[PDB]
Amino acid sequence: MVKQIESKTAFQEALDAAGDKLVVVDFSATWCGPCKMIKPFFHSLSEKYSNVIFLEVDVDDAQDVASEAEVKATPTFQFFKKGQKVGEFSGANKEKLEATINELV
Numbered sequence: 001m002v003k004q005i006e007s008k009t010a011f012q013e014a015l016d017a018a019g020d021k022l023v024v025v026d027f028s029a030t031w032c033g034p035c036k037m038i039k040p041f042f043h044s045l046s047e048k049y050s051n052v053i054f055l056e057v058d059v060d061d062a063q064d065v066a067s068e069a070e071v072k073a074t075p076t077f078q079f080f081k082k083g084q085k086v087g088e089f090s091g092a093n094k095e096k097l098e099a100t101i102n103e104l105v
Helices: 008-018 039-048 063-069 096-101
Strands: 002-005 022-028 053-058 076-081 084-090
Touching: 002 008, 008 022, 008 053, 008 063, 022 039, 039 053, 039 096, 076 096, 084 096
Parallel strands: 002 053, 022 053
Antiparallel strands: 022 076, 076 084
16 A cells, blocks of 8 residues: 655654565655645555555655655655665656656566
């Protein structure tokens, strides 16, 4: 399914429950409209890819984690693995997520 991150504490514990499988992260903005209209797409992979762990961070409620990756352009997606960043990209291209998932699959 998905998991909303409140800060970095939950972020680390989240990668712990992931184990070693892939772990994508959605950095969007709730106060924003357009950046929020793309959430039904990312959260869609949750049920379409039960073999992937999808997280949901808010640069407003979890601005502490956003400063870590220094996200200055939402929406943005990051690919984590074993707690190690292996790929990432920014752009309102939710469709690209498909070709991207087949990148580190």
